[PDB]
Ligand binder design. Sequence first.
Ligand SMILES: CSC[C@H]1O[C@@H](n2cnc3c(N)ncnc32)[C@H](O)[C@@H]1O
Ligand SMILES: CSC[C@H]1O[C@@H](n2cnc3c(N)ncnc32)[C@H](O)[C@@H]1O
Ligand code: SF4
Ligand code: SF4
Ligand SMILES: [Cl-]
Lengths: 330, 329
Amino acid sequence: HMSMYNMDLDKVIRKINKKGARTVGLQFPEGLKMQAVKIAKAIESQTPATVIISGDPCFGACDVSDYKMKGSVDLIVHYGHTPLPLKYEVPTLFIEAFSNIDVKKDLEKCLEKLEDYSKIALVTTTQHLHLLNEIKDYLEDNGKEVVLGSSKNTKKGQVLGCNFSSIKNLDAEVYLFIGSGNFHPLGIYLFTKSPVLALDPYNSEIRDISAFADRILRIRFARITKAREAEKWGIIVSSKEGQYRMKLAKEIKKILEDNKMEAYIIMADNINPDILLPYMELDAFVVSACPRIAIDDSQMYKKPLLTPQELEIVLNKRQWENYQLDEILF
Amino acid sequence: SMYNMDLDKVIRKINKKGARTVGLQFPEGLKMQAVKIAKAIESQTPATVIISGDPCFGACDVSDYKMKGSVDLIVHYGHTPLPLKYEVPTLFIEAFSNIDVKKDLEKCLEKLEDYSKIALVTTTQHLHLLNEIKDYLEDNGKEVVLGSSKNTKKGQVLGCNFSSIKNLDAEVYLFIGSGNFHPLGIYLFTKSPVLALDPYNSEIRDISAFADRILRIRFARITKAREAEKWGIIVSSKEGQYRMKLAKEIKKILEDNKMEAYIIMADNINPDILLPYMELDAFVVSACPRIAIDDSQMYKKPLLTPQELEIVLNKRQWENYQLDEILFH
Ligand SMILES: CSC[C@H]1O[C@@H](n2cnc3c(N)ncnc32)[C@H](O)[C@@H]1O
Ligand SMILES: CSC[C@H]1O[C@@H](n2cnc3c(N)ncnc32)[C@H](O)[C@@H]1O
Ligand code: SF4
Ligand code: SF4
Ligand SMILES: [Cl-]
């Protein structure tokens, strides 16, 4: 009852023992790191392995610790994300850490919020993927047509903050997102221009995303207005394997120099305000790393941080009506 | 400029090597010069510059793993190289301080009146000042000795390697530079008088000024850690700081003393990354030895060196306190 997520310890331990691993790395996103010692203690009690907890941030499957842990561990257990189509330097076991939730209490609330629509797309992220089939079957049992988008690199019904490909060609009347966060509903909204609803399986509240979307876009507009006065730019690259986009960074550099501005590529692992402070000549920054940084963290930075698409608006190459979130595609 | 950035030589080196992409690595105090240097390199060579934005604390902290495949050459400022196997070819630039030390020579001599045999000690960025200081003291009746070690040049130390000052037998040690850590280590290893000249602001400080407050802090942290029942052992993935063998030995030792211990690996260590390990009462740092000593004020829970843990477990007497060192990599 106390476990908010299924950490699948039984499976993790059986696989550790069968693999014969003697040193095992653990990676957790921010919301799961509090469980690291409990899980490490269980693994060490039931296997001959020594656990190495990765204390570094872990923002997604773009951010596996295989480069840093190469030579230190035989196996990495990575929680919270499904794997990206990358080749990892160290054997890695991905545990979804599914939400411990019964959504049956909310099915009737969802049906009433959907009374005006026949054709419904269901979307969520990794830790609620296990709920989609129950919701889909309920809706279909109540006269609805339910579609789950897929892609070459995302599971049925799944989006990532940098990959909305699976919701782009669905032709639904309404998109129901499962989750408390607003960034994924924002991208579904902007790409589909269709109604987007979102169920918080904890609040049991269903919300419309249109209001949050306009609030974010007003902020993006104000940041872009400031960036139009920029003369010298930083282009931010991350060395994180799934985030690394040096080809794009060099393309952006040439574009800025073609527009008679200075531009300098800066590469870091974790991006934060403190690492940008020394470069006092730079007026604004374009992020070639995680597409969510410029949108979700912008209030932490004094100077404007922009996506490449937003840089296109600065340069009058993209119009506001075609505002678009950044994505990473493999 | 405050430091000789040796720009003409870096540019000469880039062109001869034919580098198309060049990485730049700076410690904190030099990062603000990154844009001017990138601008000059890109103006005078065909290369594109990548500024390493990550924190950089020493030669232990080269970005050759992160930059691997991105750059043909790395220019690294402010440090002398460590005996590591650098993946990407690297060019180390000392970044010597742009200081004229003449104004402080008589003041140094005045503070050294009681002594005949004087050791001079400094770090990379002030090594170029030592000859002028040494020659002045010798013109004024002093015997001046400079220590050396296999990897550290004449008169130089680092925060994890004090071997060059352990066999000098001087009456007093004059450290050139800011900060308390290096003079604290000289004092602890020699138990001799140690004076420190900060060449930027010309202040000369004695032992109590850089050692008393810190030793009392360490003693208090040790006392608090005697109550700890569950431990974290911090390892760094940074090539020059990696001590996993030691970390695993410390884990086994703590388990022999009927306590729990968990190895946590991180790149950069900071208070925020220890907040989720709420069950842990104390930490032992098996990474850069300066972390536990210099940054203790940032962490609520005790962060100890391995030698301080020895004191907690009653395997080392407090009187035999010893700073941590990385002797082998
Ligand atoms: C919730 S996962 C997305 C968030 O993770 C954080 N994030 C992702 N990648 C990075 C990075 N390379 N550096 C710092 N923060 C990141 C940003 O805050 C982003 O909004
Ligand atoms: C001035 S170089 C020594 C300083 O660098 C910092 N430092 C060295 N290694 C690390 C690390 N792995 N993580 C965070 N800070 C470090 C510590 O603050 C120390 O006081
Ligand atoms: S949105 Fe950012 S953190 Fe999430 S998978 Fe994509 S790049 Fe990684
Ligand atoms: S003292 Fe620490 S920062 Fe300086 S070289 Fe040694 S390990 Fe690196
Ligand atoms: Cl690329």
